[PDB]
Structures are given as structure tokens and as C-alpha cells.
Amino acid sequence: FEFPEELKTKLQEHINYFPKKRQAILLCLHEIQNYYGYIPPESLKPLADMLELPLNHVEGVVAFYDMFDREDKAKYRIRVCVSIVCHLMGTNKLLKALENILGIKPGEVTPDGKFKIVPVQCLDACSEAPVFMVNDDEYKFESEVQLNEILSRYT
Amino acid sequence: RSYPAIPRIYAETTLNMLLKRAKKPRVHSIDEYLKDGGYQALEKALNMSPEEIIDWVDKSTLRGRGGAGFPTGKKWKFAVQNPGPRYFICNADESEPGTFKDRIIIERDPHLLIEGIIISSYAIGANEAYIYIRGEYPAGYYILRDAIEEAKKKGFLGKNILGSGFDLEIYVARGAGAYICGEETALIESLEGKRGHPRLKPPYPVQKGLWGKPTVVNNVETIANVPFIISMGWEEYRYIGPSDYAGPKLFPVSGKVKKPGVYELPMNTTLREVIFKYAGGTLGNKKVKAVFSGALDCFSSEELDIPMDYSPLGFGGTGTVIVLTEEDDIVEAALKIAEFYEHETCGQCTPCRVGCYEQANLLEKIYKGEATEQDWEGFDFVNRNIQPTSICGLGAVAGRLIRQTLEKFPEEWEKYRK
Ligand SMILES: NC(=O)C1=CN([C@@H]2O[C@H](COP(=O)(O)OP(=O)(O)OC[C@H]3O[C@@H](n4cnc5c(N)ncnc54)[C@H](O)[C@@H]3O)[C@@H](O)[C@H]2O)C=CC1
Ligand SMILES: Cc1cc2nc3c(=O)[nH]c(=O)nc-3n(C[C@H](O)[C@H](O)[C@H](O)COP(=O)(O)O)c2cc1C
Ligand code: SF4
Ligand code: FES
Ligand code: NA
Numbered sequence A: 001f002e003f004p005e006e007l008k009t010k011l012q013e014h015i016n017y018f019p020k021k022r023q024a025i026l027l028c029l030h031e032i033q034n035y036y037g038y039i040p041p042e043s044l045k046p047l048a049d050m051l052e053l054p055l056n057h058v059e060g061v062v063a064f065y066d067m068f069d070r071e072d073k074a075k076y077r078i079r080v081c082v083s084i085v086c087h088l089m090g091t092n093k094l095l096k097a098l099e100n101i102l103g104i105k106p107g108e109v110t111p112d113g114k115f116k117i118v119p120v121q122c123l124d125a126c127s128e129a130p131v132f133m134v135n136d137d138e139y140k141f142e143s144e145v146q147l148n149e150i151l152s153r154y155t
Numbered sequence B: 001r002s003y004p005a006i007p008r009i010y011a012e013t014t015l016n017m018l019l020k021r022a023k024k025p026r027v028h029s030i031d032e033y034l035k036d037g038g039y040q041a042l043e044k045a046l047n048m049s050p051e052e053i054i055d056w057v058d059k060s061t062l063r064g065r066g067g068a069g070f071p072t073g074k075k076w077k078f079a080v081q082n083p084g085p086r087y088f089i090c091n092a093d094e095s096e097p098g099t100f101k102d103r104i105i106i107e108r109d110p111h112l113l114i115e116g117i118i119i120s121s122y123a124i125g126a127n128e129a130y131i132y133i134r135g136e137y138p139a140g141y142y143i144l145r146d147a148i149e150e151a152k153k154k155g156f157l158g159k160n161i162l163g164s165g166f167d168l169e170i171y172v173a174r175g176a177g178a179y180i181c182g183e184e185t186a187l188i189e190s191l192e193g194k195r196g197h198p199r200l201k202p203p204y205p206v207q208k209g210l211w212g213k214p215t216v217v218n219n220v221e222t223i224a225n226v227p228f229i230i231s232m233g234w235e236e237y238r239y240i241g242p243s244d245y246a247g248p249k250l251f252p253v254s255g256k257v258k259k260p261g262v263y264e265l266p267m268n269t270t271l272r273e274v275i276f277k278y279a280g281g282t283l284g285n286k287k288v289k290a291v292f293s294g295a296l297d298c299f300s301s302e303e304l305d306i307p308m309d310y311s312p313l314g315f316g317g318t319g320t321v322i323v324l325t326e327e328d329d330i331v332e333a334a335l336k337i338a339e340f341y342e343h344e345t346c347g348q349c350t351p352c353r354v355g356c357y358e359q360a361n362l363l364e365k366i367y368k369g370e371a372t373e374q375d376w377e378g379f380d381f382v383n384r385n386i387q388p389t390s391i392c393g394l395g396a397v398a399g400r401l402i403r404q405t406l407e408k409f410p411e412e413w414e415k416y417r418k
């Protein structure tokens, strides 16, 4: 297994950024997940070598950090907050609207591999509850009609 | 350039300091910052000794805005009594429920934070500084990276800053989903490329931190105060609010209020005034049942007349105000808090590891009416026994808010027992 050059270049950049290569591990894993739509297990051995860390170190880090997913490829992660304020202000209405539009529940991926719903802890936009992200984009849920428009922008 | 979408959190100020620009929901770049006299505090600071800067920050009564309220000047003094090199860390992990005060500084007025970081780094003799921003703040990350390049371009960063002989680089690290990585020692472990496992303290980071060197960790909001202390002087800064708990404070307000958002207010403001005078009162004018101070404390309707300061009888914490009204189920709310701690314990300490899990698992059975008598007595016992042997504040407080609901809303809990 080899990183495509366009990805390897970004990884090298991150590794050159901090005074010590090993400080780059989380930025590298973000970059890998961004590229593949998950962390492929096979990617971890070449990454460990670039970081000059043991593989077991890198695997332990991927296991520890909840943003990294080794199981499911998804082009778009719909992160839905299930914490106190969003629960009070209508997380259930948001999940219902997501099932009505995409046909999936938390933990599941659409059959085309386009959308995965990820239940997450407080995203700290609580004044704008209930909150969700689509990859890096963050929104207040208003209604199913508004949600349908937002999701229409991800192709 | 174009940044990812950020909800437009309402921001309002009576002091026009931390939110002078950040009250407008958009990025303020270096030219707008410079137009408002930005980076003139940095120039003033570089003509003062580090020792003098520490003295002003001390005399200002500035206390840690991250939630513990530790005196900032006193933290700095502990650091500089230890030989260098020293490191300065901006904690931008902000992951407490209801706590969105730091993100509006980062996303809207990043140069206020950067100017703060440069002055603090100079004060403690740190030539290398880090911002650790949580993974779920990607927009904040790109905004800070661009802001730091603006600062470099204008000669506020790099070697020999404004002919002072002071060198500084600011590195931006990203989290990847762990609440615990906001704990200063777990944050340092993550900066070193490891799992976010808190360290036994003492030593405190100021004695042994990043690569074992003296390290100051400060919250975004704390650092954002430093330019004002230098610009105004500590004497003028201390005219803001009560002389014992001085300066502006950011109060993130959410749940059942008409105007949820961030309020810049003096710390002699009462909890009642935050909800009713500033946040516009309750949705549907319903009675306040409780206020969650993030996931830390629960205040009843009998505790609304407390100052929003770091006093013993004060609100304290992050200043986070989650408002529950008369129709919100306290046991349902308690379950959401248990679920949070269950998800976030790092597992190093046995009673934290099993207690956070069991507290959540048993309270769910209680909520769903599937709890045996044993599960009830179990829940009470584990709630009281998460803290023992804990090496960080998570285990120390994972039962705190829920115990407070048991003591302040016993009639609601008893309904669930029968
Ligand atoms: N803003 C947010 O999103 C979050 C905030 N928190 C807050 O974290 C707080 C608990 O934080 P801790 O760091 O465990 O509190 P702490 O009271 O143990 O420490 C506070 C600060 O003072 C320093 N310090 C304390 N005693 C010292 C001593 N003897 N010598 C030198 N330095 C000393 C510590 O190193 C730290 O920087 C809670 O009050 C909670 O509000 C927790 C989670 C998230
Ligand atoms: C589990 C846990 C998580 C924490 N998360 C944060 C955080 O996201 N941001 C923060 O500034 N402080 C956080 N803290 C507090 C820090 O350990 C530390 O007290 C603070 O960052 C120091 O800055 P201050 O003195 O300016 O408040 C956390 C503490 C604990 C126990
Ligand atoms: S108290 Fe809990 S979160 Fe803190 S170090 Fe121990 S196990 Fe980890
Ligand atoms: S509770 Fe959902 S963003 Fe904070
Ligand atoms: Na601009």
C-alpha cells in the first residue's frame, strides 16, 4: 500500500510543520480520513514510518480519537449532536427529518456511500440547537424542508 | 478565502472589549483589527520587561476563564521561577456542554487571541507557542492559520519581533474528538503525538509540561484579556466590574431563553439578570426550574440571585448558563449528563472508568422504568464513588451535577422510584 503523491505531499507538509514529526499524527489522520472518507487500516503502517513511530502507537491513537473511523467509507459525515441542549431543543426532530430524506439512522451509511449519520457529543453551538455538521460545515436544524435544501448542496 | 459554514451565534456586550468586533458574526481580518488600534498593546508590552507584564496581569485580578478561576499572573510567576526553555499553550479545546464563548473570539476576532498569545509568550520567555483547537472547530482552525500568516506578514510573529529581539512561532494543533484532551496534561500528551491521558499532578505544567519543560496552559478567553490589561493598564482594567473579580466575562446562554447567545458582562451581574435582563427571559415566560453550569453544577430557581464571579457563593465555572423550565424532566436531563461522562472518561482510573459507564447505564434503566431495587441502590452508590483515585477533574466531578439534582429535585426522582 502506497499514498497517492497528492496525499503524501500534504502528509509531508504536516510532518514538517511542528518541531517534531510525531506532533503531526492527528493532522495526518484528518488528512487521510478526508482523502479516503475513512482511515484504511493499510494506511497506518506507511503513516507510522513517515511519523517514525511504532505501528501500535499509531493504531492506539486512531482507536482513542472518536473523529477517526476505520469501519465505514462515507463521502459526507452528518455529525448530529445528542448532548443535553440539542436534546432539549429537538435532536429527535432532526434525526426523524434525516431518516425521511436519506432513509438511515445514527451509525448507518446510505447505500451509495454518500452520507453517514455520526451521533456526537456537544458541538458547542448550543444557542443554535439542535446542531449538526456536514463534514466541516455546521448548521442549526430549522425543519425537514430547510434540511433538504442544505443536503441538496452535497453531491 | 472561503471558510466552512458556522452558525451565527448571537453576541451582545455591555463593555465592548472581547466582543467589540466579535459581536458581528464574521471574520475580522488584520486590517480591521489594526484600524481599532490592534497590536499597539503588543508594541507597548515589548517596551516593558517580562517581569513588569507578569506584575500587571497579577495586579489585574485576571483569573482563569477556562473554568477553574486560577489567578493568571500567579500561574505565570510559578512558570518563570523554573529554568527554560518554556512553552505557552492556548487551550481552544472548548468541549463543555453549553460553552461556546471561546469559539466566537477564534472565528470572529482571531487577532485578539493572537495578540494575547504573543504578549503572554513574551512575559513567560516562551519562543514557541501552541493553539490546540478541538477537531469539531474546523472553521476556527482555518481562520487561525490564515490570521497567523497575516500576523507574520505584518512582523508581529517570527524572529526579532519589531526589533525587540523576541522570537515567537505559534503552531496550530487540532484535536480529534476527545473532551479529555482539554484537560491541560491530556492536551500536552496530545501535542506530543499520544492519546489524551491526563498526568498525575503535581507536577503542574508550569513545573513539567510539554517535553517536561515549564509550560503555561491558558484558556482562549483568559489570553484575550491580556491585550486590554496592557493597553488600559491594570488599574483601569480593575475599574471593570467588582475590584476583587475584575474584567469582562463571556456568558454563553442556551436552552429555554428567548435570546440564546454570548453576553459580555461584568462578573457582579447576577444569574437572574443574565437570564431575564440580558437573554430576554424564558421561552413562553415559563418558570425557570434549573440552570446547568455546563456539566459541572445544577442551580435551582432558589439560587438565581448569585453573582457570576469566582467567589465561594458565586456561579463560577465557565459562566455557562443552560436554562431548564418547569416542563423539562430533570431525570432526562441528568441522563444526558451521565451519557456525556460515559462517552468521555479516558479509562486510566478504575472508579472513573466503571463509574462513568455504570452511572449512565443504571440511570438509563431508571429513566426507562426497567431499574430493579438493586440498580437504584447501585446508581446512588456509583454516583458517590466515581472520584476515588481520580488523577483529573473529570472523575472528580462526573457525579457532581447529578448529585445536585438528587438533592434539589428529590420529588422528581421519587416519581421515577415508584
Ligand atoms: N472550557 C471548557 O470547555 C471546559 C472547561 N472545564 C473546566 O475545567 C475545570 C477544572 O480544571 P483543572 O485544570 O482540573 O482545575 P485546577 O483548579 O486543578 O487547575 C486550574 C489551573 O491552575 C493551575 N494550578 C492549580 N493549582 C496549582 C498549583 N498549586 N501550582 C501551579 N499551578 C496550579 C493548573 O495547572 C491549571 O492550569 C472545571 O472548573 C471546568 O469548569 C472542563 C471541561 C471543559
Ligand atoms: C476534563 C477536563 C477538560 C477540560 N477542557 C478544557 C477546555 O476545553 N478548555 C479550557 O480552556 N480548559 C479546559 N479544562 C481546564 C484546563 O485543565 C485548565 O484549567 C485551563 O485550560 C487553564 O487555563 P485558565 O487558567 O486560563 O482557565 C479542562 C479540565 C478538565 C478536567
Ligand atoms: S479521572 Fe477519569 S478522565 Fe481523568 S485521568 Fe482518570 S480515568 Fe481519565
Ligand atoms: S448540546 Fe448540542 S451543540 Fe451543545
Ligand atoms: Na474582512
Ligand code: NA
Pocket: B052
Ligand atoms: Na509600571
